[PDB]
């Protein structure tokens, strides 16, 4: 029988989502110093088990449906992150790295790339950020110069997830149709493209495959452009609008792992003639952890449910990503504190979570970017109401 | 056409809730455009329009349904509070003050009291707290001594909403069957009971009808007891449980009023060659206000939806009341700041909200009590899982 | 014997400050055991007769305590007064703020005419800068002052004017038009009996103090009543506010100390659940945070006051003090309200009055947000100077 | 000349502290441009340069003075931490690890141990915590059984800084004179004691030498006891009371490093046609970082100055340690955020600080322990005032 106190009972969810949640949890329980090899193995395993189909749009191209089920992608990342940051990362990048193709690819492009993404035989990547511009996407400087039937790419992308091991990169570059955000085009760039160089492998506090890409006159056929020339900025933004809610879901999963560790330690740690959990400060701290988790989860699945009605979720996805990532930091930090010295011992669950969560407040748009999106949207909506 | 970005589109709501939300908003616009006199008027107007029926249980007794639709009660309080703290208070007390009769009354008691509560011709009140015992209800000292066919009541209740204007008070008193929480009984005490004295009117920062009640040997018939002797504590707690999420909903309504004031002021206040809303600090503050409101609203209506499925919501309602009241304080405080000096000018919308919100963090389970409820429940659930 | 754990033992203080602190506390106990106008008039007279208004006036020859203003002394006076009575603090504060522009920029005649009467409490001072459309943005004020022979003709409105309606004179800042914006403002001492000066309305705020909107209907002000040179009024206003900025922080601190005393006493005395409120961990942690905020605020206040008294500009330090003490006092007072339960919102209890009293101190004399920007800009300015 | 805006100008400091601050900064620039080997080298270098003398009490035993100059130890840790967590740790443990000997040793014990601590040829350690008892010191279970002229020690200590490389351990053990906190004695245990085993080397998120010690019937001569039997708990608490303020100082130094990184990045990072520092959110963030640093520093040096008057600082040291460690976490976290993706890049200054700070909220008494110390002290002082 359905536990009506579980979040899966919320009417944001359909029965298929409850079955999916049980299925991915069982996969995690049964299947979960070399992050490159681990990523490759996880992509293959998740692909063979069918879990990468949810991040791809189009049944003809290997997707679960013709739309991307945001609630499903979120439940997958939430459950994976609750067990393994590496497994979450692997599934996430098959979505984010292929999303621009689901959204904007031709028939040939969707046929060539999406089935292999969906079955885990091609590793995807999303190459937007640059050393000098991550938040300020509209001012990117990687250039794409038209030369006959190809574009010639020159410059650098960096912080690129799966960099060095991806089979292709969706690359955004300045083609120059108009200034700023109106001068960008999107390309699918196969990893074996001559002139695409892995300039540096990047180490971060919670290790994942990351690289700086240097484009040294790399030639990309015009037929590899996603969408129309100069329409690449909106494609990047629309791809991020899908998967920002999934970053919120991963944050939530990390927080749920910390919550489980924290309540177990509160119950088991004997001190002062009782247990840690018998103290009011512990009870109030656990309560706030749980409150943050429930508010995060409600925001995540409100946004995912809304996108699954066919609606734009620029505001609601930003809210979810902001709240869940900032909140998960607080939950994880509290769980570290409950563990005392063991909370900073290398390789304990909460020590790993303390490292894992920090980047989620930065990638797919930093917290401060999300806040300004929401604040600007509030004033835009008020101005529209005043007009009418 | 349903705006799919509106909270009313959430699947926590049924079609009847969307119709109700439009109806109570229309009533507010038509009717909210001497505190005791205002409350009396509001109760009668809400009653005549049908809005007090939602807080009464039992169609036979004037209620909207045989169960209380807590999503409906929440939407009513949220909408009323967004327009007027007094209007929210008037509806809220008709619910809280009669809830113990809906839960525990006999057929005669329900017939005698609930139809007049539901049509706004009897003002209800809930008399639990005492000068020395508010949070610690189990230690109350108001005594009820059995004497023939009546009980004799001696002692004080205080902080009693609608004190002095109520037509009856649901009074919880120690009958002494067992120590502490096991020795309390509940009574419906008519305002005209000899020995029931309105001892002092209480002034609070957001003025509402409030009084200290002194019981000077007030004789209450045994047939006015609600439930069995010694079962009054559970009745008080279950009555408060009905309306807990609706206190969160009122907080949310106050926050939404503050948000509307803040956004409008940010857009309209010219300064430094632009508007206040053009500054990043303003945009970030407005964004946090909106985030707090959406998280509060989701917590309120998750809890209300869950209770309406027939489930106990100890943890979820505590989360809603805690988050919405603490969050509304923050939203209101930010709106005061956006208004500058006008934010503390008496009678401006945001100055009134700054006063109105403060008590909601204190009554019906102070924030600190809500934290402990949630924390203890987390540990209880973990113990059950590991057993 | 000096209690070495008391803040007055800090080496930020000199012996004279310890003596003053005892004196003003004694005065409060003897004199501070409805009709706000009459109360303020009485408090100004009593503070004046006791010698306490001399510390906010510059120049021994003009009734001041010293030829410079002893900021540490003014802070201790406001801190102590506010700890007992918001009205008494207000009375002393406005004798300083309302006369500071004369201490700074008056001629010998102007200082002799006004400052001795401010210092002995026989003239109530006021500072008229803000306007309905220009509070934070002082440089855009629109009250006009037109030269006409031996006088200036003033037209327009000031508002939120403390002591408005009961002041004997107003230091008014008006646009004389020598140059745009902040460079076209002049300052005038305007006696309350000036024909054309009208009390347009009395203003009611949440913690009632005498306040008014002033309307100037062609008020002719003698040219000899100008403070400083034409067009130099803006810097005079800013320097006048600068004198007393730390003292607003000190008042905030005094309100917080009152709330702290109320909270600890209630925690100790309120019986509940077979013990006292103070026996609960949440109460102990809350009291501890109140005390931490108070000590941090006090250290920031008197660091800034000590530094100014060394002859140094304290742009960053005074902004930090006013920001931290006012925001922190709000938190301390809010926690004390919570400890009192229903009594915390009962009209006229100590903590209910403090909840109303503190709110405006975060808004006037540079709102919190303005203080944050002052500090942030100064950090960047100092960094630029270091790397130049 | 003395920059009067510098914290070193505060009257909490004497001229010798300003010269010491300059001297240790110069040492850092000249010397900090295998973790076990690194710590051994740092202890030797700091000892040879004279900097370990400040943590030792008694001129006859190699100390700088007959008292421990708290302000000096704090300035040393603050400056070292601002450059290197390893160097801070090395100096800190020469203090904490020998403090019980400075406080409670006989002439013979001080002569044997302190001169080599002070010149860096003996590495000290403080062995109090146990796997089952860290916060709840009074319930420790390591047993010391008297047997002739020696005590036989059995059990484990853990989280022991310098474990595995220390030359001696000050070990607190239950001798059983009375229950709980009244049954503990202190011993100096040479590292070569038979029956003392380094059972496990411990890895933490910011690596420092750490071990679990196992005592398997280790015979410790009675002459190695510090103080009287059963008086060991107070000796442990008094040792922590000295150095808790120095943990606050180290926290402050880490925060100052993060502040320097953050303001530099704000000034240099171009974005959106300007720099990161031109945005209000950045200015307010930097302002709050600076406010937290100044309030932390004021609390640190108020506590250090007060202890250096000969006064107990249980409340003031707890306040400093709590505020500075929690505040430094916030400052460092903000600096990570300002750096974007580079903020989590391994080995960058701010990424290292994010790992370094986390343990300081846990060791020498967790934040929650400090809050309860302060809260209980407020109620104790109120009860004493009521009684008087
Ligand atoms: C582990 C990891 C994985 C990543 N994966 C990918 C990937 O696969 N593909 C990819 O393209 N990128 C990826 N990124 C890069 C990431 O998207 C960027 O780091 C991020 O967008 C921030 O850009 P930045 O590092 O250049 O920081 P900056 O743009 O320099 O921003 C620095 C800080 O400034 C603040 N800020 C930003 N804008 C404003 C503003 N307008 N006003 C005020 N404050 C502001 C924010 O706090 C921000 O963190 C990844 C990063 C990490 C750490
Ligand atoms: C405007 C208003 C209307 C009200 N209306 C009614 C009404 O109609 N009927 C009625 O019966 N009552 C009513 N009340 C009273 C209200 O229920 C009580 O004020 C409330 O229960 C708190 O009791 P108290 O005031 O005695 O505070 P106390 O019991 O003294 O509690 C003081 C504070 O202690 C803290 N605290 C409490 N328990 C714990 C704990 N276990 N651990 C740690 N901290 C704790 C909380 O912060 C609390 O605010 C109203 C109150 C107000 C202000
Ligand atoms: C009780 C009281 C007494 C007063 N006494 C006096 C007196 O005696 N004399 C006198 O001349 N004035 C006095 N004032 C007026 C006071 O100085 C102004 O209220 C204050 O300067 C704010 O101006 P404002 O009200 O017009 O708000 P606004 O200028 O409209 O500002 C509204 C809000 O905008 C925000 N803000 C401001 N600037 C920025 C910015 N650059 N970036 C981002 N956010 C920003 C702040 O949060 C501010 O509160 C008093 C006010 C009060 C409430
Ligand atoms: C890097 C590092 C270096 C260290 N160096 C040394 C050293 O050299 N020597 C040494 O003896 N020890 C050392 N320690 C151990 C350290 O002092 C302990 O970890 C610390 O005292 C916490 O004890 P614990 O780990 O057993 O946590 P616990 O005692 O289990 O406490 C867990 C958490 O409970 C909370 N808590 C504690 N008491 C209460 C209470 N009464 N009420 C409510 N909440 C409470 C706190 O948040 C605490 O963090 C070090 C630890 C680290 C991480
Ligand atoms: Cl389905
Ligand atoms: Cl319906
Ligand atoms: Cl002196
Ligand atoms: Cl000296």
Which properties best describe this structure?
homotetramer; 388 residues; alpha+beta; Butyryl-Coa Dehydrogenase, subunit A, domain 1; Butyryl-CoA Dehydrogenase, subunit A, domain 2; Butyryl-CoA Dehydrogenase, subunit A, domain 3; four-stranded mixed β-sheet; four-stranded antiparallel β-sheet; 10 strands; 15% strand; globular; binds flavin-adenine dinucleotide; binds chloride ion
Task: Provide a compact summary of the structure.
The structure is a homotetramer. With 388 residues, chain A is of the alpha+beta class.
How big a fraction of the residues of chain A is strand? 5-15%
Strand order of the largest sheet of chain A: 1-4-5-8
What is the fold-level CATH name, i.e. the topology of the largest domain in chain A?
A: Butyryl-CoA Dehydrogenase, subunit A, domain 3
**Assembly state:** homotetramer
Outline of chain A: globular
User: What does the main sheet of chain A amount to?
Assistant: 4 strands, mixed
Q: Report the total helices of chain A.
A: 10
Under CATH, the homologous superfamily of the largest domain in chain A reads Butyryl-CoA Dehydrogenase, subunit A, domain 3
CATH C-level label of the largest domain in chain A:
Mainly Alpha
Task: Kindly state the percentage of residues in helix of chain A.
Answer: 40-55%
What is the ordering of alpha helices and beta strands of chain A? HHHHHEEEEEEEEHEEHHHH
Structural class of chain A: alpha+beta
Count of separate structural domains of chain A: 3
Protein name (chain C): Acyl-CoA dehydrogenase
GO molecular function (chain C): acyl-CoA dehydrogenase activity; flavin adenine dinucleotide binding
InterPro entries (chain C): Acyl-CoA_DH_CS, Acyl-CoA_Oxase/DH_mid-dom, Acyl-CoA_Oxase/DH_mid-dom_sf, AcylCo_DH-like_C, AcylCo_DH/oxidase_C, AcylCoA_DH/ox_N, AcylCoA_DH/ox_N_sf, AcylCoA_DH/oxidase_NM_dom_sf
Domain Acyl-CoA dehydrogenase/oxidase N-terminal (chain C): 16-121
């Amino acid at each position: 029988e359905l536990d009506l106190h579980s979040a899966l009972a919320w009417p944001f969810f359909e029965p298929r989502h409850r079955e999916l949640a049980a299925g991915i949890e069982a996969w995690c329980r049964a299947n979960l110093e070399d992050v490159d090899a681990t990523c490759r193995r996880l992509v293959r395993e998740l692909g063979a088990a069918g879990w990468l189909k949810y991040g791809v749009g189009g049944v003809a191209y290997g997707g679960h449906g013709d739309t991307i089920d945001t609630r499903a992608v979120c439940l997958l990342r939430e459950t994976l992150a609750k067990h393994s940051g590496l497994a979450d990362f692997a599934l996430a990048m098959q979505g984010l790295g292929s999303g621009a193709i689901s959204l904007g690819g031709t028939h040939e492009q969707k046929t060539r790339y999406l089935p292999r993404v969906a079955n885990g035989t091609a590793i995807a990547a999303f190459a937007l950020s640059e050393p000098e511009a991550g938040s300020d996407v509209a001012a990117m400087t990687l250039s794409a110069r038209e030369d006959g039937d190809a574009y010639v790419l020159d410059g650098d992308k960096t912080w690129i997830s799966n960099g060095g091991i991806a089979d292709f990169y969706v690359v955004f570059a300045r083609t120059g149709e108009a200034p700023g955000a109106r001068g960008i085009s999107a390309f699918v760039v196969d990893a074996d493209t001559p002139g695409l160089e892995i300039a540096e492998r990047i180490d971060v506090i919670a290790p994942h495959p990351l690289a700086r890409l240097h484009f040294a006159g790399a030639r990309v056929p015009r037929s590899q452009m996603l969408g129309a020339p100069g329409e690449g900025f909106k494609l990047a933004m629309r791809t991020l609008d899908i998967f920002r809610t999934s970053v919120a879901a991963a944050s939530l999963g990390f927080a749920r792992h910390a919550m489980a560790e924290g309540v177990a330690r509160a119950a088991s740690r004997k001190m002062f003639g009782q247990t840690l959990g018998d103290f009011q400060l512990t009870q109030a701290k656990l309560a706030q952890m749980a409150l943050t988790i429930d508010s995060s989860a409600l925001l995540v699945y409100r946004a995912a449910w809304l996108r699954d009605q066919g609606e734009n979720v620029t505001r609601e996805a930003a809210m979810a990503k902001w709240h869940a990532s900032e909140g998960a930091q607080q939950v994880i930090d509290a769980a570290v504190q409950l563990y005392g010295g063991m909370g900073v011992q290398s390789g304990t669950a909460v020590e790993m979570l303390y490292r894992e969560i920090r980047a989620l407040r930065i990638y797919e748009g930093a917290t401060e970017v999300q806040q300004l999106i929401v604040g600007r949207d509030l004033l835009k909506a008020h101005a529209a109401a005043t007009a009418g």
